[PDB]
Each structure stands twice: as structure tokens, then as C-alpha cells.
Coordinates of C-alpha atoms and ligand atoms in Angstrom, one line a residue:
Chain A
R1 CA -25.2 31.8 74.8
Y2 CA -23.1 30.0 77.3
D3 CA -23.1 28.6 80.8
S4 CA -19.5 29.5 81.3
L5 CA -16.8 31.9 80.1
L6 CA -14.8 28.8 78.9
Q7 CA -17.4 28.2 76.2
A8 CA -17.1 31.7 74.8
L9 CA -13.9 30.7 73.3
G10 CA -12.9 30.4 69.7
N11 CA -15.1 31.3 66.7
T12 CA -13.0 34.4 66.5
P13 CA -13.6 36.9 63.7
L14 CA -11.7 37.4 60.5
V15 CA -11.0 40.9 59.3
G16 CA -9.9 42.1 55.9
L17 CA -7.0 44.6 56.1
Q18 CA -8.0 46.6 53.1
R19 CA -5.6 49.5 53.7
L20 CA -2.6 47.4 54.5
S21 CA -2.9 44.8 51.8
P22 CA -0.6 45.0 48.8
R23 CA -3.7 45.1 46.5
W24 CA -7.2 44.6 47.9
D25 CA -9.1 44.8 44.6
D26 CA -8.5 42.9 41.4
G27 CA -7.4 45.4 38.7
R28 CA -5.9 45.8 35.3
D29 CA -2.6 45.9 37.2
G30 CA -3.0 42.2 38.4
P31 CA -4.8 40.0 40.9
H32 CA -5.5 40.8 44.5
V33 CA -3.1 40.2 47.3
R34 CA -5.1 40.4 50.5
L35 CA -4.2 40.2 54.2
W36 CA -6.9 38.9 56.6
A37 CA -6.4 39.2 60.3
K38 CA -7.9 36.6 62.7
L39 CA -8.6 38.3 66.1
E40 CA -7.5 35.9 68.8
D41 CA -7.4 38.6 71.5
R42 CA -11.2 37.8 71.4
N43 CA -11.0 34.9 73.8
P44 CA -11.8 34.7 77.5
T45 CA -8.4 36.1 78.7
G46 CA -7.2 38.0 75.7
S47 CA -5.1 35.6 73.7
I48 CA -4.9 32.6 71.5
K49 CA -3.6 30.6 74.5
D50 CA -7.1 30.1 75.8
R51 CA -7.6 27.4 73.1
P52 CA -4.6 25.0 74.1
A53 CA -4.9 25.7 77.8
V54 CA -8.6 24.9 78.0
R55 CA -8.2 21.8 75.8
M56 CA -5.1 20.6 77.9
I57 CA -7.0 20.9 81.1
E58 CA -10.1 19.2 79.8
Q59 CA -7.9 16.5 78.2
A60 CA -6.1 15.6 81.5
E61 CA -9.4 15.8 83.4
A62 CA -10.7 13.2 80.9
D63 CA -7.4 11.1 81.3
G64 CA -8.1 11.1 85.1
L65 CA -4.9 12.9 86.0
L66 CA -6.6 15.8 87.9
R67 CA -8.6 15.8 91.1
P68 CA -10.1 18.9 92.7
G69 CA -7.7 21.0 94.7
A70 CA -4.8 19.6 92.7
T71 CA -1.7 21.7 91.8
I72 CA -1.0 22.5 88.1
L73 CA 2.5 23.6 87.1
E74 CA 3.4 25.3 83.8
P75 CA 6.4 27.1 82.4
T76 CA 5.1 30.1 80.5
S77 CA 6.2 33.6 79.2
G78 CA 2.7 34.9 80.2
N79 CA -0.3 34.0 78.0
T80 CA -0.7 30.3 78.8
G81 CA -0.2 30.9 82.5
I82 CA -3.0 33.5 82.4
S83 CA -5.3 31.2 80.4
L84 CA -4.5 28.3 82.8
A85 CA -5.0 30.5 85.8
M86 CA -8.5 31.5 84.7
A87 CA -9.4 27.9 84.1
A88 CA -7.8 26.6 87.3
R89 CA -9.9 29.1 89.4
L90 CA -13.2 27.9 87.9
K91 CA -12.3 24.3 88.0
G92 CA -10.9 24.4 91.5
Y93 CA -7.2 23.8 90.8
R94 CA -4.1 25.6 92.1
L95 CA -1.7 27.0 89.5
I96 CA 2.0 27.6 89.7
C97 CA 3.7 29.3 86.7
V98 CA 7.4 29.3 86.1
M99 CA 8.2 32.5 84.2
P100 CA 11.1 34.6 83.1
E101 CA 11.7 37.8 85.1
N102 CA 12.0 40.1 82.2
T103 CA 8.2 40.0 81.6
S104 CA 5.7 42.9 81.5
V105 CA 4.2 43.8 84.9
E106 CA 0.6 43.5 83.3
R107 CA 1.2 39.7 83.1
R108 CA 2.2 39.5 86.7
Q109 CA -0.9 41.4 87.8
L110 CA -3.3 39.3 85.8
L111 CA -1.6 36.1 87.1
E112 CA -2.0 37.5 90.6
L113 CA -5.5 38.5 90.0
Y114 CA -6.5 35.1 88.8
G115 CA -4.7 33.7 91.9
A116 CA -1.8 32.1 90.2
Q117 CA 1.5 31.7 92.1
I118 CA 4.5 32.9 90.3
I119 CA 8.1 31.5 90.5
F120 CA 10.5 33.7 88.6
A121 CA 12.1 28.0 83.1
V122 CA 11.2 24.8 81.3
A123 CA 14.1 23.2 83.1
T124 CA 13.1 24.7 86.4
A125 CA 9.5 23.5 85.8
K126 CA 10.7 20.0 84.9
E127 CA 12.9 19.8 88.1
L128 CA 10.0 20.9 90.4
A129 CA 7.6 18.4 88.7
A130 CA 10.1 15.7 89.3
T131 CA 10.2 16.7 92.9
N132 CA 6.5 16.8 93.2
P133 CA 4.9 13.8 91.5
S134 CA 1.5 15.1 92.8
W135 CA 1.6 18.1 90.5
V136 CA 0.3 18.0 86.9
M137 CA 2.5 19.7 84.3
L138 CA 0.4 19.8 81.3
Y139 CA 3.5 21.0 79.3
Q140 CA 2.4 23.2 76.3
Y141 CA 5.6 22.5 74.4
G142 CA 4.8 18.8 74.1
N143 CA 1.1 18.2 74.9
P144 CA -0.7 16.9 71.9
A145 CA -3.8 18.8 73.0
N146 CA -2.0 22.1 72.1
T147 CA -1.8 21.0 68.5
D148 CA -5.4 19.6 68.6
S149 CA -7.0 22.9 69.8
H150 CA -5.7 24.3 66.6
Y151 CA -6.3 21.4 64.3
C152 CA -9.9 21.1 65.7
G153 CA -10.6 24.9 66.3
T154 CA -8.5 27.6 64.6
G155 CA -7.9 25.7 61.4
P156 CA -11.5 24.8 60.6
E157 CA -12.8 28.2 61.4
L158 CA -10.2 29.8 59.1
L159 CA -11.1 27.5 56.4
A160 CA -14.8 28.3 56.9
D161 CA -14.2 32.0 56.7
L162 CA -11.4 31.9 54.1
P163 CA -11.9 29.1 51.7
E164 CA -9.9 30.9 49.0
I165 CA -6.8 30.8 51.3
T166 CA -3.3 30.6 49.9
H167 CA -1.1 31.3 53.0
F168 CA -1.4 31.1 56.8
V169 CA 1.0 33.3 58.9
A170 CA 1.5 32.7 62.5
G171 CA 4.2 33.0 65.2
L172 CA 6.2 30.0 66.2
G173 CA 6.8 29.4 69.9
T174 CA 5.4 26.2 71.4
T175 CA 4.6 25.6 67.7
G176 CA 1.1 24.4 68.5
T177 CA -0.6 27.1 66.4
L178 CA 1.4 26.4 63.2
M179 CA 1.5 22.6 63.7
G180 CA -2.3 22.3 64.4
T181 CA -3.6 24.9 61.9
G182 CA -1.0 24.2 59.4
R183 CA -1.4 20.4 59.2
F184 CA -5.2 20.9 59.0
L185 CA -4.8 23.4 56.2
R186 CA -2.3 21.2 54.3
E187 CA -4.7 18.3 54.7
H188 CA -7.5 20.3 53.1
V189 CA -6.0 22.9 50.8
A190 CA -3.6 22.0 48.0
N191 CA -0.5 24.0 47.5
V192 CA -1.4 26.0 50.7
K193 CA 1.6 27.9 52.3
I194 CA 2.4 27.7 56.0
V195 CA 4.7 30.5 57.2
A196 CA 6.4 31.0 60.5
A197 CA 7.8 34.1 62.0
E198 CA 10.2 33.7 64.9
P199 CA 12.5 36.1 66.9
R200 CA 15.8 36.8 65.2
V201 CA 13.1 22.7 70.1
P202 CA 9.6 21.7 71.5
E203 CA 8.3 18.2 71.0
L204 CA 5.3 19.3 69.1
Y205 CA 7.5 20.6 66.2
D206 CA 7.0 18.9 62.9
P207 CA 9.6 19.9 60.2
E208 CA 7.5 18.7 57.3
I209 CA 4.8 21.4 58.0
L210 CA 6.5 24.8 57.5
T211 CA 6.8 26.2 54.0
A212 CA 8.6 29.2 55.2
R213 CA 10.3 30.8 58.2
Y214 CA 11.1 34.5 58.5
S215 CA 13.3 35.6 61.4
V216 CA 12.1 39.0 62.5
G217 CA 13.9 41.5 64.7
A218 CA 12.3 43.3 67.6
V219 CA 12.5 46.7 66.0
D220 CA 10.7 45.5 62.9
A221 CA 8.0 43.8 65.0
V222 CA 7.3 46.9 67.2
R223 CA 7.4 49.2 64.1
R224 CA 4.9 46.9 62.4
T225 CA 2.5 46.7 65.3
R226 CA 2.2 50.5 65.3
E227 CA 1.6 50.5 61.5
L228 CA -1.2 48.0 62.1
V229 CA -2.9 50.1 64.7
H230 CA -2.4 53.3 62.6
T231 CA -3.6 51.8 59.5
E232 CA -6.3 49.2 60.4
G233 CA -7.2 50.2 64.0
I234 CA -6.1 46.9 65.4
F235 CA -4.5 47.2 68.8
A236 CA -2.3 44.1 68.6
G237 CA 0.4 42.7 70.8
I238 CA 4.0 42.6 69.4
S239 CA 4.0 39.0 68.0
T240 CA 1.3 40.2 65.5
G241 CA 3.8 42.8 64.2
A242 CA 6.5 40.1 63.5
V243 CA 3.7 38.1 62.0
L244 CA 2.6 41.1 59.9
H245 CA 6.2 41.8 58.7
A246 CA 6.3 38.2 57.4
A247 CA 2.9 38.6 55.8
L248 CA 4.1 41.7 54.0
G249 CA 7.1 39.7 52.6
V250 CA 4.9 37.0 51.3
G251 CA 2.6 39.7 50.1
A252 CA 5.3 41.7 48.4
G253 CA 6.3 38.5 46.7
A254 CA 2.8 37.6 45.5
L255 CA 2.6 41.2 44.1
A256 CA 5.9 41.0 42.3
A257 CA 4.9 37.6 40.8
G258 CA 1.4 38.9 39.7
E259 CA -0.2 36.0 41.6
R260 CA -3.3 36.1 43.6
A261 CA -3.0 35.6 47.4
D262 CA -5.2 35.6 50.4
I263 CA -3.0 35.6 53.4
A264 CA -4.6 34.7 56.7
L265 CA -2.5 35.9 59.6
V266 CA -2.9 35.6 63.4
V267 CA -3.4 38.4 65.9
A268 CA -2.4 36.2 68.9
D269 CA -3.2 39.0 71.4
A270 CA -3.8 42.7 71.9
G271 CA -1.6 45.5 73.1
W272 CA -3.0 45.8 76.7
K273 CA -0.2 43.7 78.3
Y274 CA 2.6 45.4 76.4
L275 CA 1.8 49.0 77.3
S276 CA 4.2 49.1 80.2
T277 CA 7.1 48.5 77.8
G278 CA 6.2 51.8 76.1
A279 CA 6.3 50.3 72.7
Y280 CA 3.0 52.1 72.2
Chain B
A1 CA -18.3 35.0 58.6
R2 CA -15.7 37.5 57.6
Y3 CA -15.4 41.3 57.6
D4 CA -13.8 43.6 55.2
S5 CA -13.1 46.0 58.1
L6 CA -12.6 46.1 61.8
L7 CA -15.5 48.6 62.0
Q8 CA -17.9 45.7 61.1
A9 CA -16.6 43.2 63.7
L10 CA -18.7 44.9 66.2
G11 CA -21.7 43.9 68.2
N12 CA -23.1 40.4 68.4
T13 CA -21.3 40.0 71.6
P14 CA -21.6 36.8 73.7
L15 CA -23.9 36.4 76.6
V16 CA -22.8 34.0 79.2
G17 CA -24.5 32.6 82.2
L18 CA -23.0 33.2 85.6
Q19 CA -23.7 29.8 87.3
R20 CA -21.5 30.3 90.4
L21 CA -22.6 33.8 91.0
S22 CA -26.3 33.7 90.1
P23 CA -28.2 33.4 93.4
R24 CA -30.0 30.3 92.1
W25 CA -29.0 28.9 88.8
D26 CA -31.3 25.8 88.9
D27 CA -35.0 26.1 88.3
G28 CA -35.7 23.2 90.8
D29 CA -37.1 24.7 96.5
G30 CA -37.7 27.8 94.4
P31 CA -37.6 29.0 90.8
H32 CA -34.3 30.2 89.4
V33 CA -32.8 33.6 89.5
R34 CA -30.1 33.8 86.8
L35 CA -27.5 36.4 85.9
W36 CA -26.5 36.7 82.3
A37 CA -23.5 38.7 81.3
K38 CA -23.4 40.4 77.9
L39 CA -19.7 41.0 77.1
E40 CA -19.2 44.3 75.3
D41 CA -15.4 44.0 75.8
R42 CA -15.7 41.9 72.6
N43 CA -15.6 45.0 70.4
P44 CA -13.0 46.7 68.1
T45 CA -11.6 48.8 70.9
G46 CA -12.8 46.7 73.8
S47 CA -15.8 48.7 74.8
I48 CA -19.5 49.1 74.4
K49 CA -18.8 52.6 73.0
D50 CA -17.8 51.1 69.6
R51 CA -21.6 50.7 69.0
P52 CA -22.4 54.4 69.4
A53 CA -19.0 55.9 68.2
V54 CA -19.4 54.2 64.8
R55 CA -23.1 55.0 64.5
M56 CA -22.6 58.7 65.3
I57 CA -19.9 59.1 62.7
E58 CA -21.7 57.2 60.0
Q59 CA -24.9 59.2 60.7
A60 CA -22.9 62.4 60.6
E61 CA -21.3 61.3 57.4
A62 CA -24.9 60.7 56.0
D63 CA -26.3 64.1 57.1
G64 CA -23.4 65.8 55.3
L65 CA -21.8 67.0 58.5
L66 CA -18.5 65.2 58.0
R67 CA -16.0 64.8 55.1
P68 CA -12.5 63.5 55.8
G69 CA -9.7 65.8 56.7
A70 CA -12.3 67.1 59.2
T71 CA -11.7 67.4 62.9
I72 CA -14.0 65.9 65.4
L73 CA -14.2 67.0 69.0
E74 CA -15.7 65.0 71.8
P75 CA -15.7 65.1 75.6
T76 CA -15.1 61.7 77.2
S77 CA -14.1 59.8 80.3
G78 CA -12.2 57.6 77.9
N79 CA -14.1 54.8 76.2
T80 CA -15.9 57.0 73.7
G81 CA -12.6 58.8 72.9
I82 CA -11.0 55.5 72.1
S83 CA -13.8 54.2 69.9
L84 CA -13.9 57.6 68.0
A85 CA -10.1 57.7 67.7
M86 CA -10.1 54.2 66.1
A87 CA -12.9 55.0 63.7
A88 CA -11.4 58.4 62.9
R89 CA -8.1 56.8 61.8
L90 CA -9.9 54.5 59.3
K91 CA -12.1 57.3 58.0
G92 CA -9.4 59.9 57.7
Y93 CA -10.5 62.3 60.4
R94 CA -8.7 64.2 63.1
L95 CA -9.8 63.9 66.8
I96 CA -9.7 66.1 69.8
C97 CA -10.7 64.5 73.1
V98 CA -11.5 66.5 76.2
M99 CA -10.9 64.2 79.2
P100 CA -10.5 64.8 82.9
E101 CA -7.0 64.4 84.4
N102 CA -8.3 61.8 87.1
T103 CA -8.5 59.2 84.3
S104 CA -6.4 56.1 84.1
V105 CA -3.0 56.3 82.3
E106 CA -4.1 53.4 80.0
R107 CA -6.8 55.7 78.4
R108 CA -4.2 58.5 77.7
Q109 CA -1.8 56.0 76.3
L110 CA -4.3 54.5 73.8
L111 CA -5.6 57.9 72.8
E112 CA -2.2 59.0 71.8
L113 CA -1.4 55.7 70.1
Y114 CA -4.4 56.2 67.9
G115 CA -3.1 59.9 67.7
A116 CA -5.9 62.0 69.1
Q117 CA -5.1 65.4 70.6
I118 CA -6.3 65.4 74.3
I119 CA -7.1 68.5 76.4
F120 CA -7.2 67.3 80.0
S121 CA -9.9 69.3 81.7
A122 CA -9.5 69.8 85.5
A123 CA -10.6 67.0 87.8
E124 CA -12.9 69.3 89.7
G125 CA -16.3 69.0 88.1
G126 CA -15.8 65.7 86.4
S127 CA -17.7 65.2 83.2
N128 CA -19.6 68.4 83.6
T129 CA -16.3 70.1 83.2
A130 CA -15.1 67.9 80.3
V131 CA -18.4 68.7 78.5
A132 CA -18.4 72.4 79.3
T133 CA -14.8 72.5 78.0
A134 CA -15.8 70.9 74.7
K135 CA -18.7 73.4 74.3
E136 CA -16.2 76.2 74.7
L137 CA -13.7 74.7 72.3
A138 CA -16.6 74.2 69.9
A139 CA -17.4 77.9 70.3
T140 CA -13.9 78.8 69.1
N141 CA -13.5 77.1 65.8
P142 CA -17.1 76.2 64.5
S143 CA -15.5 73.9 61.8
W144 CA -14.8 71.1 64.3
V145 CA -17.6 68.6 64.5
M146 CA -18.9 67.6 67.9
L147 CA -21.1 64.6 67.6
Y148 CA -22.1 65.1 71.3
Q149 CA -22.7 61.7 72.8
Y150 CA -24.9 63.0 75.7
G151 CA -27.5 64.0 73.1
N152 CA -26.9 62.2 69.8
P153 CA -29.8 59.8 69.1
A154 CA -27.4 57.6 67.1
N155 CA -26.2 56.7 70.5
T156 CA -29.6 55.5 71.7
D157 CA -30.3 53.9 68.3
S158 CA -27.1 51.8 68.3
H159 CA -28.4 50.0 71.4
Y160 CA -32.0 49.9 70.0
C161 CA -31.0 48.4 66.7
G162 CA -28.1 46.3 68.1
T163 CA -27.7 45.6 71.9
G164 CA -31.5 45.1 72.4
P165 CA -32.3 42.8 69.5
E166 CA -29.2 40.8 70.4
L167 CA -30.4 40.4 74.0
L168 CA -34.0 39.4 73.0
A169 CA -32.5 36.9 70.5
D170 CA -30.3 35.2 73.1
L171 CA -32.4 35.6 76.2
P172 CA -36.0 35.7 75.2
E173 CA -37.0 34.6 78.8
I174 CA -35.5 37.9 80.1
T175 CA -37.2 39.6 83.1
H176 CA -34.6 42.4 83.8
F177 CA -31.9 44.4 82.1
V178 CA -29.2 46.1 84.2
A179 CA -26.6 48.5 82.9
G180 CA -24.7 51.6 84.0
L181 CA -26.3 55.0 83.5
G182 CA -23.8 57.4 81.8
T183 CA -24.8 59.1 78.6
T184 CA -27.9 57.0 79.0
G185 CA -27.8 55.5 75.5
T186 CA -27.4 51.8 76.6
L187 CA -30.4 51.9 78.9
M188 CA -32.6 54.1 76.7
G189 CA -32.1 52.2 73.5
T190 CA -31.9 48.7 74.9
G191 CA -34.7 49.5 77.3
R192 CA -36.9 51.0 74.6
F193 CA -36.6 48.0 72.3
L194 CA -37.2 45.5 75.1
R195 CA -40.2 47.2 76.6
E196 CA -41.7 47.0 73.1
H197 CA -41.2 43.2 72.9
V198 CA -41.0 41.8 76.4
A199 CA -44.0 42.5 78.6
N200 CA -43.3 43.3 82.2
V201 CA -39.5 43.8 81.6
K202 CA -37.7 45.7 84.3
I203 CA -35.0 48.3 83.2
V204 CA -32.6 48.9 86.1
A205 CA -29.9 51.6 86.3
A206 CA -26.6 51.7 88.2
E207 CA -25.0 55.1 88.7
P208 CA -22.0 56.3 90.8
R209 CA -22.8 57.6 94.4
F210 CA -26.2 67.7 84.3
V211 CA -28.9 65.6 82.7
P212 CA -28.0 64.2 79.3
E213 CA -30.5 65.2 76.6
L214 CA -30.8 61.5 75.6
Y215 CA -32.3 60.7 79.0
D216 CA -36.0 59.6 79.1
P217 CA -36.9 58.7 82.7
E218 CA -40.0 56.9 81.4
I219 CA -37.8 54.0 80.2
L220 CA -36.5 53.2 83.7
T221 CA -38.0 51.0 86.5
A222 CA -35.3 51.9 89.1
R223 CA -32.1 53.8 89.8
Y224 CA -29.5 52.1 92.1
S225 CA -26.6 54.3 93.3
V226 CA -23.3 52.3 93.9
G227 CA -20.2 53.3 95.8
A228 CA -16.8 52.9 94.3
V229 CA -15.9 50.4 97.1
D230 CA -18.8 48.1 96.3
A231 CA -18.0 48.3 92.5
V232 CA -14.4 47.3 93.1
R233 CA -15.4 44.5 95.4
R234 CA -18.0 43.2 92.9
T235 CA -15.6 43.5 90.0
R236 CA -13.0 41.5 91.9
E237 CA -15.7 39.0 92.8
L238 CA -16.6 38.6 89.1
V239 CA -13.1 37.5 88.1
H240 CA -12.7 35.2 91.1
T241 CA -16.0 33.4 90.5
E242 CA -16.7 33.6 86.8
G243 CA -13.2 34.3 85.4
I244 CA -14.5 37.5 83.7
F245 CA -11.9 40.3 83.9
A246 CA -14.2 43.3 83.8
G247 CA -13.8 47.1 84.3
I248 CA -15.1 48.8 87.4
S249 CA -18.4 50.1 86.0
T250 CA -19.2 46.3 85.6
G251 CA -18.8 45.8 89.3
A252 CA -21.4 48.5 89.9
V253 CA -23.8 46.8 87.5
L254 CA -23.1 43.5 89.2
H255 CA -23.7 44.9 92.6
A256 CA -27.1 46.3 91.4
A257 CA -28.0 43.1 89.6
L258 CA -27.4 41.0 92.7
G259 CA -29.7 43.4 94.6
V260 CA -32.5 42.7 92.1
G261 CA -31.6 39.0 92.0
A262 CA -31.7 38.8 95.8
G263 CA -35.1 40.5 95.6
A264 CA -36.5 37.9 93.3
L265 CA -35.1 35.0 95.4
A266 CA -36.5 36.3 98.6
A267 CA -40.0 36.5 97.0
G268 CA -39.7 33.1 95.3
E269 CA -40.1 34.6 91.8
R270 CA -38.3 33.6 88.6
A271 CA -35.8 36.2 87.3
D272 CA -33.6 36.1 84.3
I273 CA -31.4 39.2 84.5
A274 CA -29.0 40.6 81.9
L275 CA -26.1 42.8 82.8
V276 CA -23.7 44.7 80.6
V277 CA -19.9 44.2 80.8
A278 CA -19.1 47.5 79.3
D279 CA -15.3 47.0 79.2
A280 CA -12.6 44.7 80.5
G281 CA -10.1 45.2 83.3
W282 CA -7.1 46.2 81.0
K283 CA -7.6 50.0 81.4
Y284 CA -8.0 49.7 85.2
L285 CA -4.8 47.9 86.2
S286 CA -2.9 51.1 87.2
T287 CA -5.6 52.0 89.6
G288 CA -4.6 49.2 92.0
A289 CA -8.2 47.8 92.2
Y290 CA -7.0 44.3 91.2
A291 CA -4.1 44.0 93.7
Ligands
68V301 O1 6.2 32.6 71.0 C1 5.6 33.5 71.5 N1 5.4 34.7 71.0 C2 6.1 35.1 69.9 C3 6.6 36.4 69.9 C4 7.3 36.9 68.8 C5 7.5 36.1 67.7 BR1 8.5 36.7 66.1 C6 6.9 34.8 67.6 C7 6.2 34.3 68.7 N2 4.8 33.3 72.7 C8 4.9 32.2 73.5 C9 5.6 31.0 73.2 C10 5.6 30.0 74.1 C11 4.8 30.0 75.3 C12 4.1 31.2 75.6 C13 3.3 31.2 76.7 O2 2.5 32.1 76.8 O3 3.5 30.5 77.7 C14 4.1 32.2 74.6
68V302 O1 -20.8 56.2 82.9 C1 -19.7 55.6 82.7 N1 -19.3 54.7 83.6 C2 -20.0 54.3 84.7 C3 -19.2 54.1 85.9 C4 -19.8 53.7 87.1 C5 -21.2 53.6 87.1 BR1 -22.1 53.0 88.7 C6 -22.0 53.7 85.9 C7 -21.4 54.1 84.7 N2 -19.0 55.8 81.6 C8 -19.2 56.8 80.7 C9 -20.3 57.6 80.6 C10 -20.4 58.6 79.7 C11 -19.3 58.8 78.7 C12 -18.2 57.9 78.8 C13 -17.2 58.1 77.9 O2 -16.4 57.1 77.6 O3 -17.0 59.2 77.3 C14 -18.1 56.9 79.8
PLP303 C1 1.7 31.4 72.1 C2 1.8 32.7 71.4 C3 2.4 32.8 70.0 C4 3.0 31.5 69.4 O1 2.0 30.5 69.4 P1 2.5 28.9 69.5 O2 1.3 28.1 69.1 O3 2.9 28.7 70.9 O4 3.6 28.8 68.5 C5 2.6 34.0 69.4 N1 2.1 35.2 69.9 C6 1.5 35.2 71.1 C7 1.0 36.5 71.7 C8 1.3 34.0 71.9 O5 0.8 34.0 73.1
PLP304 C1 -20.5 54.4 78.5 C2 -20.2 53.4 79.6 C3 -21.2 53.0 80.6 C4 -22.6 53.6 80.6 O1 -23.3 53.5 79.3 P1 -24.1 54.8 78.6 O2 -24.7 54.0 77.4 O3 -23.1 55.9 78.3 O4 -25.2 55.2 79.6 C5 -20.8 52.2 81.6 N1 -19.6 51.7 81.7 C6 -18.6 51.9 80.9 C7 -17.2 51.3 81.0 C8 -18.8 52.8 79.7 O5 -17.8 53.1 78.9

């Protein structure tokens, strides 16, 4: 038990996708090729972003860059702003997000609910921060604490739950998830594969880390999200579907090569905020 | 630990202290009065109903009453439908939900996504009408299996064997348990396990301003009615002060738990009060309650 919602963060579960795996059981036909989904919607605000956000705020607090009542500014497409907004409420900070306008209304309403101000993006944010040296722009595209939240949280957990791991599949945006988790995994698990999926350059990006990079179209992503919820029950956001497409490629490949695989993949958030789009 | 199936990643939900919101968080001018939030939005479909939906099916499975291909029928205000819709996809069953039209669009959406048939019963009569409609649909077509959540003891048992033990493990110093009073499973099963293990424990109900066959009034200390308006206000207050983005029934439980908390404070008595967050705010956004 916890004294704050902020502590009820991480230690997310890992779930075997038996129905969707290319081959769950070892058989006379070859070794298993299993997909394991890690449910990051199970964090305080519904997404993996609670990890880096919280750690970024705590990290600047400790660096002495924040004082109560202070204004925090972050460019975000939604999830980090929501995470940050939650944390700024409890800690007594103001939040301003710089966001693209083609975003789902659900994001707006949660930002508003948490008391965030929205300006309808990195460049914009950078300009405003230059204009207001009072403000703190944690900057998820370059803040080492993004990568650390994953090196120190996601990665270790994944290793603890899946020591037989062969591949890790995540989305590539700020790149924190793959740089943190991936470097930790490569530092502990020999010949481990680190696989991005991106839509068809931050400062956190390390080119040495990725093993693979699938580009995934929007139609494939949506299609795959639906398959996931039809077949495993998992009500995931759309990034998960791009991720899952790239997991089925690696899987198909392990199946064809008769090699054993256990393929951890990230469910970065749930479908809730994507409903308005009518992709579900 | 890991799970071979989403069906297993269920229960063992977190319990978090509400420091800002508890009347008196520090035991120092009075003993403390503490609110503890058990977060049942941490469940496969984001609701406490995962506990009972799963256990009803499995227990039906056991008793011989189900074998896939089979079609389940259930009346629901949404949460139970969703749980059952998810569990029915994995187990190879078809689902019909009877649900009133007043319900939020988000519930409809999810139900269809999981691919349940939904008969929207008329708003007039609420759940009585959703239930009566299912009984009549059951009466045509006896092959459809109605688990019946208002009377299936696998509902009360899911909380007796899960929710309760989990509470007692995390908050052994517990003095009250507050939860909404719907099918009555949560309060009956959690309340029965706790009365057995914790002497003097208070079981407190919240209900909105027919009697389910699960309902044993012996288990309850007190029934608090709560208006929608107070529920919305307390739900909003919960996010503003503790960051917890809860559903509206959680506001009603919060409103009732502060009553009890306020009671303990004013009499200088220690209270450690556990309240259920039955679901998150996601399915309530279209209502406008969060604007
Ligand atoms: O990169 C993604 N999502 C994503 C979607 C599809 C694919 Br394919 C890969 C990643 N999200 C993201 C990236 C950078 C910042 C934020 C943010 O929430 O502020 C989110
Ligand atoms: O009783 C509630 N919610 C509720 C709302 C306000 C108050 Br006060 C107490 C409970 N939900 C409920 C009850 C019975 C069945 C279902 C269902 O999801 O089918 C939901
Ligand atoms: C942030 C995010 C990603 C990408 O994670 P990064 O660590 O930023 O690369 C993918 N999907 C969702 C839903 C996200 O919020
Ligand atoms: C079911 C439910 C309740 C009440 O619980 P019962 O165990 O049915 O009495 C309260 N709130 C929500 C959101 C629910 O789905």
C-alpha cells in the first residue's frame, strides 16, 4: 500500500498472449514463439508516460529547479501532458502543454480535468521557454530521466518476469522506452533483440541500441489493435497495434527459422482515449 | 510474476492512502482518521466486475451449465456486460446484454467492440426493467445461459475470496469498509470475510438517492443514500486532490466515507476507512461531469 497515487506506478503485469502467439507450446513441429504483453495502461493516468513524467519531476525537484507554484511547460501529443498534469496538481505546480490540434478530444478533457492549460510544437515550446526563463521545460525528448525511468523501472521488471526473453518490442517516439529498456536488456541479456515500430530526431536517441525498425502504417496499426482485443481481450491504444504488427513479423520470422522466441511487447496505453476516433 | 492470460491479471489491486483528503492523516490533537482507496480500475476491463464476471463463468463452466458456442445473457448497467464480453471472447461464448438506454456511449462502444449483442431496454424503470427484460428473453429461448449477477453467489464469493482477504492483508488496522450497494456482492462478500476476521468492523453502504437475492442486511452497519450531485462533486474532488480519475459511483462512496470519517474525527476516535474505486473516469467523459 501507498501514501500516494504516484507510488502506485510501475510493477505492471506481464500477460501471455496464447491465442495470438505464432506457437505457444513446444511441439514436434518446433520450439515456441510466444508474445508477452506488458500492460502499461496500469499506471496512475493510463499510460507508460507516468514513469518518465514522474521521474522527470522528481529529478528537477532534486536538482533544485522547481519551487512550489512554479510553471512547468512541455510539448506533448497527449500522454506525457496528462501524466505531468496529474503530478503538477499534487505537487502544487502549474502545467502548460503545447500540443498538436489534431488530437483526440479525450486528451483535452483529461488535461482540462487535471487543470492543465493547453496551447494548440517542440519549437513553439522552446520559444516560449526562451521567453519565460521562470518556466521549467523538463523536455521529454532530451531529459535523461526519461531514459532512466525505463532503465531503472520497465527493464528490470521485464527481466524479472521474462528471464527467457529474446526480443523487446516497443514504439519509438521520444525514444525513452526503447533507449532505457533496450540498453538495460542489452546490458544483461546476450544476443537480445531490441525492435522499434514507428509511423510510416530527439536527443535521447542512441543508434547503437536498435536491432530492428519496422515502419508501420496507420491502417495496419488500427487493424492490429482490433485483432488484439478480439483475440486476447486487451483494450489497447493504437501504438500497441503498430507494436503488435512488428511483433508478428519478428514472430513469423522466428517460426519460419524454427527458433524459440519469447517476445516481450509494450502496451503503452488503453483504448479509452482513442474512442472518439471511431477506430473501435 | 507473469500470467498466461489476461483473465488471471485480476485482483490484487493497489490500496493507496489519501493523505490530502483524509480528515486527519497524522495520528498525532487527536487520533488519525484515514481514507484508503482500493483501486479496482486496475482490472482486465477496468472495473471491479472482472472479479465476479470471471468467477460466475468459471463456476458455471464447472457445474456443467456452459460449453463454448453457448450464448450467455445478462442484464447490466454496463460494467458487468463488459467484463462478461471480454471473458466470453476468450472462452468462445456469445453474449447478449440488456442495458438501459440512459447509459453512457462509452459502454455501448466497448460492448460492440468486444462484439456483444445489446438490447437497450427503456430508461423508464432502470435496472428493474433491464432485469425484467432479461427474464423475458430467458423465457424465450431456454438454451441461453443467464448467470444472474443479482443472485449468483459466485459474485459474493469473488469478493469473499479476493477483495476481502486483500483488504485485510494490506490494511489490517481497518475499522470501516465503504462501497456502493448495487448487486450487493462487494459489500456482502468483503463484509462477510472482514466481520469474521476484524472485530468491531463497520460495513457501510452507499446507494443512489427490487431487492437482489444476494442481499443479506445482517452484513451492513449502515446505508447512506447519495445524490448524483454530491457524487459528481466528490468524484471531481478526488481527482483534484488525490489525482485519482474515478467513475461517479466512486464519488458517492467518497461522499459517504467522508461522513463516517467526519464522524470519527468529531468524536476523537481512530478510524482507518477503506473505500472502493469501482471504475475509472474513462466511461463517464461524455456525461460532462468532468468539464
Ligand atoms: O510515439 C508515440 N506513439 C507512437 C504511436 C505509433 C507508433 Br508506430 C509509435 C509510437 N507517442 C508519443 C511520442 C512522443 C511524446 C508523446 C507524448 O505523450 O507527449 C507520445
Ligand atoms: O450499482 C452500481 N453503481 C452504483 C452507482 C451509484 C451508487 Br451511490 C452506488 C452504486 N453499479 C452496478 C450495479 C449493479 C450492476 C451493474 C452492472 O454493471 O451490471 C452495475
Ligand atoms: C510515449 C508513447 C510511445 C513511445 O514511447 P517513447 O518512450 O516516447 O518512445 C508509444 N505509445 C504510446 C501510447 C505513448 O504514450
Ligand atoms: C457493481 C458496481 C458497484 C456496486 O457493486 P456491487 O458489488 O454490484 O454491489 C459500484 N460501482 C460501480 C462502478 C460498479 O460497476
